Every structure is written in C-alpha cells, then in structure tokens.
Amino acid sequence: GKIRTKTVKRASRQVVEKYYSKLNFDFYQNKRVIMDVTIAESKKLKNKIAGYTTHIMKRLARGPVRGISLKLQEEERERRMDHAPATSDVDKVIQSGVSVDKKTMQMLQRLEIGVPRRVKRA
Amino acid sequence: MSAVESGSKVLRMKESDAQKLLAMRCHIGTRNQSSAMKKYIYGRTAEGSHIIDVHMMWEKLILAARVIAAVENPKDVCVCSSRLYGTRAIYKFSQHVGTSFHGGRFIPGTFTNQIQKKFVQPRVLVVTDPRTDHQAIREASLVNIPVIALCDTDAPLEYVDIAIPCNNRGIKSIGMMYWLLAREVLRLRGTIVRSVPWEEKVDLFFYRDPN
Amino acid sequence: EWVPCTKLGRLVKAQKVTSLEEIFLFSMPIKEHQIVDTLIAEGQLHDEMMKIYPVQKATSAGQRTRFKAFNVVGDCDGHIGIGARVGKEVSLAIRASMIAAKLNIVPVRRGYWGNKIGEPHTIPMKVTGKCGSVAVRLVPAPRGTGIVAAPVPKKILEFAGVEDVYTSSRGKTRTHGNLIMATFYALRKTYGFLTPDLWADTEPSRDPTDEHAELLAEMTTA
Amino acid sequence: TIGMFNEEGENVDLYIPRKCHATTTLIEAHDHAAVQISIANVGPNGVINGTTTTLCIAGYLRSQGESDHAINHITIDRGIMRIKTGKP
Amino acid sequence: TKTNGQNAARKLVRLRCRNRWADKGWKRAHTFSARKANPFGGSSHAKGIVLEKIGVGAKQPNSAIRKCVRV
Amino acid sequence: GTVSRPRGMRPKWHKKRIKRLKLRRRRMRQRSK
Amino acid sequence: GFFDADLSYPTVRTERMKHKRRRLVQGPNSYFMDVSCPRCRQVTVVYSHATTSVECKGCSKKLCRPTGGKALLVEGCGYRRKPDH
Amino acid sequence: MTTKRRNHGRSKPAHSRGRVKPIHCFNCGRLTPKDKAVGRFVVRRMLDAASARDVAEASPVYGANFPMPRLYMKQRFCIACAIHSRTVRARPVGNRKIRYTKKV
Amino acid sequence: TMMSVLANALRTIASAERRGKRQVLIRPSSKVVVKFLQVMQKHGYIGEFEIIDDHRAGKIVVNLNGRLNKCGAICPRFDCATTDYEKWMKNILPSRQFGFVVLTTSLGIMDHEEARSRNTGGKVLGFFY
RNA sequence: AGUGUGGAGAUCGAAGAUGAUUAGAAACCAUUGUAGUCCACACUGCAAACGAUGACACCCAUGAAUUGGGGAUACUUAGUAUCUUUACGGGAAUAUCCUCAGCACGCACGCGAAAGCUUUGAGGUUACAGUCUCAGGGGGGAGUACG
RNA sequence: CACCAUGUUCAA
C-alpha cells in the first residue's frame, strides 16, 4: 500500500504548476528542486512529493492531465483552434449543392421565400 | 418574432438564412416525438426522422435574439452546455455577444448557494439541451430565471420558456444555431449592418477534437 | 459588518431597494436576513419564541439529542415570518431560527367584514392552510370580535396584524410544529386569491436587478 | 383603480401583485419560479429602440411544461411573432 | 358516503337511530344494564356497613399496599 | 412473518379452540334437555 | 408559433379523426351507391353498410355480401357514390 | 403490513382473471400459481467442455460439423426455492422495479 | 346515470378553470344551464359562450377568462327565504364583498343580491366566485 | 374442506402405522396408508371469497405497448410499404394513420400521516352538496352468551 | 439444508 495521500498529491500538483520548466523525468534532480521551493517539517513528505511530481511529468509528456493548468500550454493550443479555413464549410456545402428529402422540399415550397437556389432533391 | 410595430419585413428569414439552415441539417429531428414539441414538427420523413418547421424555427430564434438583445448589461445571460459538442459554440457565442458561459458539468448550487464563491445570479439562461442541461434549468426554477433552450424533437419543456426547435446533436448543426443567434443579436444592436454579410466564420463555432 | 453576497442584498445596502414590497412584488428570494433588518423600521420588527422541543437520533452508543426551535417574526402591520431550525444547543437553535424567520417573511392581505370604514381589521376571505394532518381555517369576523383562536394560532395572527378572525382547527393540533406552519400557510394564501378588486390589468414594472444592472456590475468589478 | 379601497378613498392594499399574462394568476411573493421576460422593440431597421415589452408567467405554468406554449400565444397576440408564412 | 335526496329524511333518521347505539356513552345512558349493575343505583353516594379490612397490592410498577375495606 | 403482532395465539387456532368450546357447551345442554 | 385549437370550430384534421358520436355534431358514417347488375346493367341503390344481401330487382342476382363493416360488392359491378344531400 | 409490490408478486392484475392453476415447484414440489412462480427456461450442455472434447473425439458422428445435443428444461420455482437457490435475490427498493424481458 | 345536468356543467367549468384552459365544452345543456351561465357572464366571471344545436340536448363552448375561482351546484335545491340570504353567504361564500349565490325564483334565475332587492325567495341553484 | 346415496380408486394423501432426529418430537425428514382426491344426483354457504379499494354518471396531462371489431392506403382539407398464395381463399399475416371496447405499464396536476394513488384515482373536498346503498365509532370480553 | 432450547421484578 503506497498511495499518495491528498496532501502529497495536492502539493505535487502545485509544484508542477509553478516550476514546470525546472522539473525533469528523474526523481533525484527533481527532489533537489522540491527541497528549496517547499517548506515542510518532514523529509519523507518532500520525498513523496518529488516521486509524484516526476509521475506527473511523465504523464504530461504523453498528454494533458486533469488538475494541472499551465498557461503557456493552454494559450499555445488555443491559438491552434482559433485558425479558420480559407473558405467556410457551410459555403462549400452550398456550392456543392444542398440535397433535401421529399418532406423538406414540400415545406420549402410552402415557404413565403420559396425554395432556395442551390437546393435539390435527393 | 419577425413581426414588428412598423410592419417592416427586416427580421424575416431570407434565402441566405434558409440555405445555412438546410446545409447544416438544423431541420432534422430525432424520430422520437414529444408532446411539447409536436407543434414544431412539419412532418416525418420516409426513414422516420422528423422534420422541423423552418418558419417556426426562425420565429423562435428571433424571439430569443430579441430577448437576449433586450438585456442592457451582458454577462448576466448565461449560456450553458453539457454535450461538449456545444462547448466551443457557447464559447464563441460569448466572445461576440459578450455573455457568461459554462461548459461541462454544472456544479449544483451555482445559482442557489449564495456563499459558494463561484455563485452567479444571471437574468437569462441559455442552454443547448433541456435533457442534458437539466441541472441548470432546475436551479433557475428556484431563483426566477427564464430559460431559452435549443430543443430537439424529443425535448422535455419543463421550466423552459423560449424553445428553439433545432437539431442540437450534430457538431455542424449546433455551431450554426449559435452562429445565427450570435449574428442576429449583433444585428439587433448597432454592432453590424444587415446588408453586409458577417465576416466571422461558422467554422470557429464547430467542436474540435482535443488531440 | 455586512458584505452582501447577492445582488438583492447589494441593492438593499445601497438604498436602491427601500421596501419589502419591491421584493414581494418580484417574488425574489431573500438569502440574507440583513435585508429584512434594513427594510423594516427600527422597533417595528418583533420576535417571539413559539416552541422548543428535543429530537433524538438513536446511535450505536445511546442516542443523540438536538433541539428544534420555532420563531415568529412580524411588525403587526401585515408582515409575518415563521422559521424553524435545529441545533445541538438550545441557544444555537434559537439564533438560527430567528434568521430563518426573517428569511421566510411574507405579506398578509387584510380586508373587511362589512363596511369599508377605517383601517382593515380582518382577512379578506376564508382561507385554509394545511401542514401534515393539521389544517387551520380562518374566517372573516366583524369588528370587535378579536382573534377567536387557540393560543398558538392567536400569537401568529397577532404578529401578522389582523384584529378580528374566526379560526377553526382540525387534525392533530397538538403537533405544534405543523400547527405553527398551518397558520402561516393560511396567511400566505391571502395574497393569492383573485378578488374582483384585482381584476384590472397592471402596467409592467422593471426588476430591481434589471433597472440597476449597471450599478451592480461595478460592485463586483470594484 | 386597482386594489382594495376605503370609504375615504385611501388604497388599503399593502401592494398589488403581478398577474400572469397567460392564466390571470396572482404571482405570490414566495413562489420563486415566476419569471419576467422582456422582448426588445425593433424599429423599422434591424436595430432595437429603448422600449421593451415584458411578459409575466406564473411559476406553476413553467412546472407543467406549458410556458413555451403560453409565450407563443402571447407574442402572437401582441403582434410579435407571425402565426404563419405569407404567400410565395 | 350517505343519502342526499330532498325527500330522503326517513332514511337519514333511521341511519342516526341505528348508529347512535355504537356510541358507548350514548348506549350506556339509554340502557338499564349500567344502572342495574351499578351498586349505588344511579346515585352519587350510598351508606354501608364495614365487613373486613383488606390490603390490595398496587399495580406495577408501583409497589405498595393500599388500605381497603369490604362494605 | 406476513402479519402484524397478534397479541395472543394464532387467530386460526383460537377460532378452532372457540369452535370446540361451543361444541361441548351444546352437548352439555342437550343432556339436560 | 402555430394555430391554437378552437373547441367550437375544430380543424379538418382533428374533426376527420374523430368518432362519429365523439364529433362536435353527431352524424352518420354511411352513404348510398348506384350499383349496376353485372349481367343486367340495371342500376339499384345499395346501402354502403348493407347487412341484408341486396338483389337485383330484375336479375335476382346477389349484388353485395354482408360483412362486419362496409358491404362487399359483387365482382364485375360498377358503383358510384350518390350525393348525401 | 404495507403493500410491498404493486404487482403483489404475481402477474395477475385486479380485473384480468380470478384463478390461475398452480404448478409443482421444480425443487420441492410446492404448489405455487403459474404466474407467481419464478420461471426460467434453461438450455444445458450434456457434457462440460473437457468431457465434450473426450466424447466427441471418440464419436464418428460428433465433432466440429455436428454439435452435441443439449438439455432443454422449463424450470418453475417456488419463491422460497428460487431465493435459496440464488436464481433470484432480494433487491433494493429502488432496484425492485426493473424487469428483463429477454434472457441476458 | 347522470341525474343533475347543472351539477355536471358547473363541475366541468370549475375543473377547466383550475387547469388554466381558455375554453370548455359542456354536454349536455339545458335552459337552467344557460340561464346560470348568463348570470356569471353579466358579472364578468366568464366570457362569451356559444350554444351549438345538434337536434338533441345541445352543447355549449364557454370562453374562460381567469376570473372564476370556483362555481358549483348545491343539491338538493334547499328552498331559501329572504331571511336565509345571510345564512347562505356565511356558509358557502368566501366573503361578503364578492361572490354570488344563484337561486331560482318565481321571477327567474338570479343571484342572491338581485333576489334580495326584488324581495323574493327561491330555491338555491349554486354559487360562483 | 366437509355431509348423504351410488360408482371409481391410478397418483397424492387428514387419521393411523413404522423408521429417523431429539433432552423430549405418534412434528418438520423417510417408507406407507384410511377418509378423501375423480364422477352422477342432493346438501352445506364458513375463504387473505383481495384490488384488504360498493354500484352508476361526468371531467381529467404524457410516452411505449397489448387484446377484439371497424375505417383509409388561432388556417379551406396534406403520406406509405412487406411475405406467402391450388383452396373453411374476390385469401392470411404484416406496415403506417385513425377509431370504439377491454386487461394493463413507465405518471402532469391534485390528493394523502405516510407508504403511495393518479383518464385503471385513493384527484376534481373546510373553496366541504351528481345519485343510491352497505358498514365503523379506543383495545378486550366476543362474533362469545341467550333467544 | 445433521442438532443449536432459555434468560426473575422495577430503574439508569
């Protein structure tokens, strides 16, 4: 039974959030960083935090981890989603021809505006 | 709500608006009918899928827009979503219209727990689906908050006041209904003109895989 | 010493809402008991302890005893409030139930029996209020009648501001938790009955959180 | 003109409650489900003006699931929504 | 449930007459079995002659001896 | 256990005990008659 | 927004669905037809829900068959629905 | 005391029928009504996987092309016999209402 | 079977008002039913109502506003004198300020306020408020 | 279940018998077994004879089904197929929509002490009145005694 | 699926 209690897990999640650039994939160099960026009465807890910070870093290299918020990663990935195609997708469907079923065309014919130009049956 | 006091036809659905609705399949139901949404259904296709009236969809869409545009101070109109398919839509809608939003799990007590430190008191609530956003609608029933909801053919209409009959399942359909709603609210203000088409693309309203 | 956590409480402290009737008109819930402290004139609001009794939960080692306290608040001028709370201590339960009494404050409609002379003295119509099996029926009475009610309903009807009434009770009236709430529910029903006096159409009004929306934004902002 | 009055003419009522616009139901002070929806008035062009038209719905109508149908009836009555499309 | 006819007074009179006998207080005051069994014969007080003294053990949970006499 | 507290023996067996008591009472009156 | 139902003036769709007694005003469900003898070409008026087997007056030929509902007309006959009124 | 089941434990509504003839329980023979009894239709292999392999190895007719026969029994149980044999268990009050219309 | 037609009609109207309906169909109809409805109409408790002829006991469609709390029939008719008007408002009416007791009198079907002014007793038909 | 008279008597089986178990155990278990169980005629009229819910009538929100009979293939009217087919056969069953009648399921008001009921009310009730009828009045004694 | 009966009177 070697579960990291919530005190170790919360503190190791705080360290990764604040010192992600300084951390690494090894326990011993990370434990050195934990030694001076943390205040704790116990060396054992600092040892368990260093073990779980390294576990978080190995998890972060494979993908995003719930409970960790890194602003540099978030903004960089947000800019990726902000990019738009040269032409709109709804336009491309219209220029390619909108296909409707029988019931939809009956409703369109009953409309005051009539059937739109680039709309055909299926 | 296309009818105005002067009798002008300015808010009525044009041919461009109908094309956008038809391309994104916003008129497609769920084959499962509901008593509250029976009126909004024009008919049933041969394969069983229900077809949403487009006049009734547009009348309800403008009514919601005129209600949202009537809120002098934004950010007390909350746009909630739980499907994760409308999470980017409500984020983009809030970017232009200027409203509050919350995607993902609705934390219970957000509208009722006054000491939560994450406690908000909106004036209007907008949700993507009454069934999946039942938590937000339930709290709004305790604090006098009207609800505007994008409702499908099988939606339950308890505690929702303005129901937009729409296809709130597909990625492209949800993006268009929030794009059309955002465009109309901006048009109802002085932000953009009706003649010039909107420069913002509906693709920014679509949901993207996190990968 | 009061930092409002709600838009209504912020408006009350900023003196933008000055009466309980604006809250009553727009059906807004009251989440802070300090809203009633401001909006009721000093010395008008009175409190009284109706009932205190212990409730027990059987546990593995003996049992646990807590105390349920009933408080009645009211200005004797058309406002009544009933609130019940449980605490591990009698004093703690008493304090919590005074807060709950102010939070559950309702308006009471007072009318006439015969001629509409002077201030209203009785309820406008027959009303009943039910809690559990207990139902309390209040009947309008002529002037000079007084409150013909049991001592527990009589105290609530005195705090509500009615002078003459005929009261009948049914069920287990010795269950004073239900008897206190049954009287309170009957008085709440007075403003839900549509009388030909209220048939006329009234013009729309602006919600206080709508009218002062720009003021409330800058409070949270700064 | 609305409320309980005296023989001297004074208004006896403490306050005049709102009435639901669909059921003519007095909206009580402690129901907390009744809403007030204000629809913006639009000028000849697409831009709104300062005026709005507000509807009051009792909280029991929303719990039944009939507040959507009631608002449809009211907005058509007040000339806000169009009941059907015109002739092509 | 009961009858509600305009000319149904005979049924309502018999209903109360038959069902009043289920009232133990009413039946006791309208029958002679209570007075015939009552030693005092329907009177408040009555004189007597003492026969013997008896001590009655009080019912539980009480434990005592109550002084009593046969009269 | 399908029933509530009887406060006595089983009602079916009390009914049978009463049933036999009536039989022996009508036999004692028969022999005197 | 759609059209609200009117109790005194029901629409065609709802009135057509209704049972003849459940209708707003009670009315019959049957009619009369002009059926011609297959071997005679002589026309007789036949009830739509006839339960007695109708014979051609000259032919003496069965023109219909009883059923639990509408009468089944003979093969080779021609019929036209007579106006109700 | 209180009504435990709206079903009353049987598949007999109030105005459906009066009497349903009882069956003998599969295990102990207790006479229980046919709609109340806990009925299970089982299809059992005559031999287990290892025993079938040995017998089918010695069988000219049985193998991959021709399957071995099975046992088909409709078993109806008394309520006491079904609970003890664990073909059916007591359930939480909320979970009591869920029914399965097909073998799962 | 149906024994009182007015009692059935008033239960149908009262049920529709509690349910918030704008219209109600009444079947069957009589002269007493129509005369009762006209008394409520002249006091503003119901809107326009329409009688449909079906060559039988007709049907009535009543347009309902939200002003009617409860209407009902008192059975049996319970003949009422001019001195019993006060005792009937004390029993069945919510207040002395509003609500009407409808009686059938030799001068016609009218509410208790009109009947008292005409100085006529009658048989109590019902109430509405 | 029981009774009478004739049958019948395979299985099961009150009473009874034997063997176990047990401190005891003509109890549960085992092997048997009489009356019964089955039939005809005649009695009896005692059930958790239950939905522990009297009968008749009105109104009453929703979705998926089910059994029988039919019909169709504040708007002036809104489709649809599948399989078998030399004689209880101008057939049978399906699909879609509607409708009357029946047994119901998951259910919006409302009701209820609650459990729960809910067009199948236990709803439309202190805002108490559609009609008729039966029963109840703290627990026992006692459904006993007498007639 | 061998056998497994009981707990003096009031009051914490």
Ligand SMILES: [K+]
């Ligand atoms: K149950």
Ligand SMILES: [K+]
């Ligand atoms: K049947």
Ligand SMILES: [K+]
């Ligand atoms: K039975």
Ligand SMILES: [K+]
């Ligand atoms: K045997």
Ligand SMILES: [K+]
């Ligand atoms: K007897």
Ligand SMILES: [K+]
């Ligand atoms: K002993």
Ligand SMILES: [Mg+2]
């Ligand atoms: Mg048990």
Ligand SMILES: [Mg+2]
């Ligand atoms: Mg039990």
Ligand SMILES: [Mg+2]
């Ligand atoms: Mg009992």
Ligand SMILES: [Mg+2]
């Ligand atoms: Mg025999």
Ligand SMILES: [Mg+2]
């Ligand atoms: Mg044996």
Ligand SMILES: [Mg+2]
């Ligand atoms: Mg019996």
Ligand SMILES: [Mg+2]
């Ligand atoms: Mg019974």
Ligand SMILES: [Mg+2]
């Ligand atoms: Mg009564």
Ligand SMILES: [Mg+2]
């Ligand atoms: Mg008794």
Ligand code: NA
């Ligand atoms: Na003692």
